[PDB]
Amino acid sequence: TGRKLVAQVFLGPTYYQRLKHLVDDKIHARARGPVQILTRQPVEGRSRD
DNA sequence: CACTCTACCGATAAGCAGACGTACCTCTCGACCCTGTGCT
Incomplete structure (x- = not known):
């Protein structure tokens, strides 16, 4: 307003x-992607999805 | 039938050991040895 x-x-x-x-x-956002081989759960880390 | 010496299963603690420890996240950096024995 210049006031x-x-x-x-x-x-x-x-x-x-x-x-x-x-x-x-x-x-970072994940919908789906890599899982661990042993537990088959989402992998750790932003860099690895 | 008053005693006092050893048997007991008890309890006492005793020193022992063994057992435990916020959450989630980002990244970088390094990862056997020793000796038999065929080759040439």
Whole structure:
């Protein structure tokens, strides 16, 4: 709205860090796929479905 | 028929050992030996 905020903001430069935790590295979904040979249950791990 | 010395099955603890330990998730990195015996 271009309107002047009622509160005054604490604004300034701050040193931030990008961390090795990226959402796309973590997002995982399984419907069906590989199973363990012995127990025949879904295998472990995002990387292996 | 008053005694006190050993037999008992009891209980006592005793030291023993053996037995247990949040959840779910991501990734990387490394994985026998020793000696008989035929080959050439």
